[PDB]
Amino acid sequence: SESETLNPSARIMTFYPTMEEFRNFSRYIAYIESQGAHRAGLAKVVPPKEWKPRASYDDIDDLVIPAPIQQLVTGQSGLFTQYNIQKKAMTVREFRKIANSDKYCTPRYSEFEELERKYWKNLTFNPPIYGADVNGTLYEKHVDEWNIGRLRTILDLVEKESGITIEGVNTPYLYFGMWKTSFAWHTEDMDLYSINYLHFGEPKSWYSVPPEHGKRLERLAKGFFPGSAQSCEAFLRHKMTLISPLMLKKYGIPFDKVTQEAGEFMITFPYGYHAGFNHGFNCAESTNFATRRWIEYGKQAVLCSCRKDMVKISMDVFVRKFQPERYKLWKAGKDNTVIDHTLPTPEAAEF
Ligand code: NI
Ligand code: NI
Ligand code: NI
Ligand SMILES: [Zn+2]
C-alpha cells in the first residue's frame, strides 16, 4: 500500500522546516506524516535558526518547583521499576545548584554511547531529583508559532465544549532535569500526540517503539511484570517501568534512539511508546495535542483500570462531530473499526 511504502523501516525522522512551513503547526504535522514520520512514534523537528520562543532564561531563578521528585529505581538485567519520593518545594536556582554539584552532575565521557552505558549501569544508584510536572510555560506571550500553550488543534474541543482543563494534557508542563533523571516507557494519556521542546541545558535522550509494533512491547512488559499486569490492564501508564535497549534487542522489540539538543522539538505520535533520560541540568516544556487521525486512537485507548492514572477524556464529542456515520454504532458497542497505524492523518492529503 502507499502508506506502507513510506518510512518502511519506521525510523525516527528529523525535519528542518523553513520559517514559512513552520508558521502553521497542524499543517506541518500533517506534512511530516505524509513523509511517514509517525511510523517511528517519534520525530525531531529543528526550528528555523531565526526562531526563538523566549529572549532569555536569566529571569527564572526564583520560579518555584512545587513537587520535585526523588527517583528511586529498583531492578536488574535491564528491567526496572521507578518509585517516586516527593521532596519539598524548591526554586530553579536551588535545583540547578544541586544538579551541577559534584554529587549529581554529569559524568565525564566521549561518545554518546558511553554516557548511555553509564546511565543503564548506574540508574539504580545515587537517586536523582526530577523537577517534573511544573504548571507553566517559558514561552513569551506574543510567540505565535509552535506555542505549546496554544497550538490550536482539535484537542481544543474538550475545553471549548465542556470547559474541562487537564493539567499537562491541554495545558503545559515544565520539566527541570538533572543527570540520570528518567521518563519511563509510556504512550500519552488517551494515546494522544505530544510536543516536547528543550528550552535550555544538556540533552535529553529518547527511545521509541513504532506504534504499529506497540503490542509487541506490551507483550514483553506483561510477561516480565506479571504482578502489575494482573493488577492493571494498562500498568505502563503509571510511568514506573524502565526497560533497557539491550533488553529490547534480546527479545526482538523494534525501537530507535535519538538525542534531543537544546532548541529542538520532539513530536510523539498516537500509541507511540517512548522513554528516555536527561544528560544533565536542563528544562523542557511539554503538552498533548491531536489531529483527526487521533480520534480512533482515543476511542480504542486501553486505560489504567486501577485508579493510579485518572486521566480520561470523553470521546463522544469527537465521534459526533467527525464520525457521525458511526456514532450510533459506537454507542452500541458495535464499532469494530480497525486502526492501520501506517496511514497518515487525513489533513495530509494535499501533500
Ligand atoms: Ni515492521
Ligand atoms: Ni510522553
Ligand atoms: Ni509481529
Ligand atoms: Zn493502573
Q: Is residue 3 in a domain?
A: no
Resolution (A): 1.8
Structural domain count, the chain: 1
CATH number assigned to the domain comprising residue 116: 2.60.120.650
**Parallel/antiparallel/unpaired status of strands 13-15 and 42-45:** parallel
Q: 255 lies in a domain?
A: yes
In a domain, 97, yes or no: yes
Q: For residue 23, what are the contacts with CB-CB under 8 A and spacing of at least 6? A: 144, 145
Q: Which residues surround ligand 4, an ion (CB under 5 A)?
A: 232, 304, 306, 308
Q: What is the 188 CA–ligand 2 centroid distance (Å)?
A: 5
d(C-alpha 331, C-alpha 273), whole Å: 28
Known binding site for 2-oxoglutarate: residues? 130, 196, 204, 239
The residue type found at 141 is K
Q: Does residue 290 belong to any structural domain of this protein? A: yes
Cell, residue 271: 500509541
CA 299, CA 191: separation in Å to the nearest integer?
9
Q: Could you list the active site residues?
A: 168, 175, 186, 188, 274, 286
Four-residue CA torsion sign, 27, 140, 182, 100: positive
Residue 209 CA to ligand 3 center (angstroms) comes to 13
From the CA of 267, the nearest ligand is 2
Summarize the annotated binding site as residue ranges. 130, 186, 188, 196, 204, 232, 238-239, 274, 304, 306
Structural contact between residues 263 and 198, judged by C-beta atoms closer than 8 angstroms: yes
CA angle 104, 108, 114 (to 5 degrees): 110
Which range of residues forms the domain containing residue 272? 12-351
Q: Is residue 1 part of a domain?
A: no
Question: Does residue 7 belong to any structural domain of this protein?
Answer: no
- Tell me how far the alpha carbon of residue 214 lies from the centroid of ligand 3, in angstroms: 10
Instruction: Quote the ligand 1 centre to 210 CA distance (angstroms).
Output: 8
Is 5 within a domain? Answer: no
Alpha-carbon distance 231 to 218, whole Å?
15
Q: Let me know the angle formed at the C-alpha of 32 by 29 and 34, rounded to the nearest 5 degrees.
A: 110
